[model samples]
Target: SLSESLAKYGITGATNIVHNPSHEELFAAETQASLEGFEKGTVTEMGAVNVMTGVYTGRSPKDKFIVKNEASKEIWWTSDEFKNDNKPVTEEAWAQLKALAGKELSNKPLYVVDLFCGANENTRLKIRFVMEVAWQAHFVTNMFIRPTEEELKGFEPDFVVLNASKAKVENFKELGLNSETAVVFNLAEKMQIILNTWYGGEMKKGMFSMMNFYLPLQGIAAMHCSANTDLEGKNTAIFFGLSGTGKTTLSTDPKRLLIGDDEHGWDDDGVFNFEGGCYAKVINLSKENEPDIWGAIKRNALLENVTVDANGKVDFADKSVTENTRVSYPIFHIKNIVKPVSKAPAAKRVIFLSADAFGVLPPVSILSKEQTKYYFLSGFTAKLAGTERGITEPTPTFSSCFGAAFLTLPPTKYAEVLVKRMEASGAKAYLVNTGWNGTGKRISIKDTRGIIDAILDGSIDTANTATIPYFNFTVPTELKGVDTKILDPRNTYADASEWEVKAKDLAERFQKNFKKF
Candidate 1:
């Protein structure tokens, strides 16, 4: 069938053809010799396959990409439109091997990474997480820059991927990705599922929107997540959780310098941050609702895709753009800042945020080495997907933790590094749930902030090291229409029970995922 099928391409080789025949049909045929060494084909094709092509030349250290359009002719993308000198992708990447060009004598892909924390402010707790949890991996050299548009333009990544596919790819290359480039593609929601599979994990298709895209890429073996610079030398902390879980609210400390708000990394060199600015989900974000984060999104800032007034200020109350709308601006834009950039080492403390919908997970508790491994593997979150009207119907979703969409490396590798880093640095790891306590959805922003503040000031240090406490992860007895024993989605409701039942359901999912390890 392929012999007859490939006639259009004038193919002559007997080798099997592989292609994605969708809106854009990409076909490839390798020589029999090239395919001969393989004993049996893997049922699922995972790695990049070597194939003969029409427009491209030899491959390896070369990073050239020839895109064929609907006319079946090759398209040449130029890199001249961007404001900065960053190159998103380049031609030389395909020709040269990574070992020969991109890496140093160590054969590492990235020598230095600029990790930005995408939040209103980088609180001490959040900074500590970047230093302690991500730094211990021995993965990449890192530097954390509190982003400014001018400075963000300085650290051109070999690759610059975004979630906005239609946002223009070539500019990233011309401006950020130079000759030594590899891959520069946009990061998006669906890409999250694909990357998770690549990283050897999976998440519910519906829950994709709630999770952040940058987190998982940090888990990608050779890649790094940027930096946590502003809050350096001083001890720092990290807080993790789902949307409206205070990832931005509780972490932005006006008294201390903001290292980063979300998504950062660390290694031997130091802590790294990601993002040039902070992008807070503004559905419920406002001066009164989330003062710190809202104030950061005021006039003279970047309010992505949101409608503005005649004077060009943001409309924080507008829900038309998308209920889960966001605002992005340089971390340096904030008044309280220490360093414009960070090049510090890993952290002294690591904190994971959890919005306990079930009201059973502890308000705050320290974790052991194994527990850290378990929770890192279980970056969970819950959301109502497809809720955008006239676009997609909303559906309820529950991911193991809240970060299923952002994990880039395999769970095993993530676990190994998180465990090793905690041990090596003697860093303390704590879990704090910014969710309901006595009742589901009953948590308050003021209380959450107060608790987080207490922990950061070292007032809770005694309880952290002294307590060997395991907060109740026990499930409650009943729900309107759900199984008492099985917490799996197949038999659960998004909103159907007592606080303990919901808490147990999520916790059960966390424990159920342990077998993969």
Candidate 2:
């Protein structure tokens, strides 16, 4: 049956072609691979499987490429950062990579996983993953939407993702690839070929890049944000934030029903999850800090690059390998999920999160419509040490639309859609600072949650506000559960002149980055 499905892709004559195997089967395969010294780590205290990646602990943003075809002209290319420089590959180069992938897989038994991308049937896509490892098949099954037995019989993939993780390319100069490691996507062929990296995030983010490209063409706003709704679904909110800014942490509220934790889509009807699971960073995770995500870890979850002790206890705080350690688990793994399909109506409130390490930003503030557009395109956040390779200190960075790396179109395109939706639905926008102030103290989760609660309960809609200098936004002087003094950054500094100096510096940084557009 598996070979029958893969035959459509011109793959044939393999000894083993396992299609959508059960969790038990995958565990059995993992056990065998472990016996032969392929995989490391052991079962966690909660029965979740944890494995370590040897060298690569995160996604290779620099290695990603898009084929320059007829659709290539419309893509937004900017020169702000190295990752934003999305160079194009020729069709001739792509053909060679595809052929190389096929040749690499010809001698080995292949693992295939067919699944869906978006949750809503109207906007969903059928995706097929062909890889060389059995664990990767299980990873996709845990990450993507699984289909019924009847649906599998007639399933046809809208796109195919060929995992050539071990296949290296020597023709770097001729093929226009960055290095031996390549993550190439050919939109015209509806296929993605990954090369020379065993990082599981490449496969996940590879498809996300495809969705970011195609979904906007269909008039749907694809976003790298998390969403949630109140108990009666009366108040829905969407969070836009880059990594380490608590987009996933804040959205996983026990009182609210989660729609999705990472990626989502917004249409005329409502908001829906683009993914069936969440890929969360767990470098310093603790049960006391993240109970919902902690409880969600179980048999079906997949842990990546986490350090485990000889006694089988996982050291979630150990970053000796990487600080980007992660866990992939189904949305259902989260206890308080919105059942059936995690779909919700249009949001009444939209918030952008920033971990302002500089501490010049207000703790919580209300944004004007124009200010929302400005900050949305700016997508400011700080990159703490060890979040990626070669970083040792907190560095201020800006990622357009909060997800610059995955965005295939111009930032204005998504901003226009956001402005249009906000205008039509009359949704409110706010900025929450989860980072720290200049005093080197981080904003406590309790205080942040209090601000979010105020937004949800309508207290912030009528609160007394005062405008701040440089940054043209108003901060609420008082919130129900939050201290009134911390609302304004000016009060946090001991010297007024010092606060003004730092504020002007951050303001200039914003102005400088915004000029690129």
Candidate 3:
């Protein structure tokens, strides 16, 4: 029966195909068939399955490709500096690559998961994932919204993701490719093929890059942020920014129930989570500081690249495998969450989170309508750019809408809809720097929590404020709880002139990047 039914999705001859396996079934496949070539997962004491993604412990963006076809022509074809964002792959090469992955996957015991991406039923895409590794199937269930038995009666995928990571393309040149590994997106046909590198991250992100392309085309505000609501779903506040800026940590506020920690879409109905789970970075995880994420580690959760002993103890600080340690768990793992039974409310506040590398930005500021528009397009910085010398001449990195790398249409297209929604929603917009300035380390979580408390409770609205250097966004001179001394960036530096030099250069870079859009 399995061999007869495998060809429709590009697979040939295979056996033992598991369709929509239960958590225990997927776990059993993983535990029973754990291999060096297959998933190498160890069941932990907490019942979380900890695995290591050998060789590639992180995202392979350099190997990412947009299959160059007529339908992808309108996509943001890049200019000079950052060309890897939408790198092209020939149709011939992609065809060969897809054929190769199918050959490799067909013989293996495969797992098929048919699910939807978005939480908003009106806009969600019916997706089917056919994977070789069962833990990755576990990942699929953790990340995407599962359909009901009634809904799965006759599932048809709007998009299909086919992965055979065990199939390493040894001579990619035969297929007109450079590397042995590939992450190919066939935009025209709505499919993705990944070969080599079993980093389960590519499993989600390959789809994210597609959704980044797909939803924006439909006039939906596809976002790279965290969304949460105060219970009853009446008051939702979105942390609209990128990774490392506390989107995961900040938006998982215990007082506020979560919508989703990463991807979200804002529609006429409201902001809904694109994911049904949390993909949290647990490198140097602190249970005291981030209790919610800490507690999310439990049964059937998937921990990637984490160091685990034979006894099932997780060493969060150990980076022997890789520092990009991550964990994925279902939304229910969170103690407090907004129910899908009640729609995620339209955001009452949109807070942009930025961890400035130059560290010259104010820790907290209220953005004007114009300031919101300007900064919304002024995205994240290079985590790799800073050196001790470069620290003095800090290089600023800009990606449009903080997700320029993943965007299919131009950044302007997404920005237009985002700004339009910001105006229509009448959502108060604020820019909070969750990063470090030139002179000091990161602003404390204590201060960040206090700042957010003020912003949400309407304390910052009446607080006396002053203009900051260059950007002109107003920082509250005093807040009831936080140390106001940390509000000004210049105060961090001992020398006024040194701070001026740093501040001016950072502002100049921001202005230059803004002019690009």
lDDT of 3 by residue, 25-93 (tens): 877777875376547778887678888877677666666778888988877775674443687778888
Better of 1 and 2 by lDDT: 2
For residues 97-209, write the lDDT of model 1, one tens digit per residue.
22121121121111122333322232211110000111111111111223344543444332211111111223324433333323222221011101101000011111111
Off by over 4 Å in 2: 1-12, 33-41, 78-85, 384-392
Quick one: how many clashes does candidate 2 have? 0
Q: Candidate 3: what lDDT?
A: 0.77
Candidate number that wins on TM-score, 1 or 3: 3
TM-score of each: 0.51, 0.95, 0.94
Candidate 1: minimum summed lDDT over ten consecutive residues — where? 192-201
Badly placed stretches (over 4 Å) of model 1 are: 1-157, 160-233, 288-295, 298-300, 305-315, 318-321, 343-345, 384-402, 463-507
lDDT of candidate 2 over 207-307, digit per residue (tens): 77777777787778888889999877657899988766788888978789999888888888888888888888887889999998888788878887787
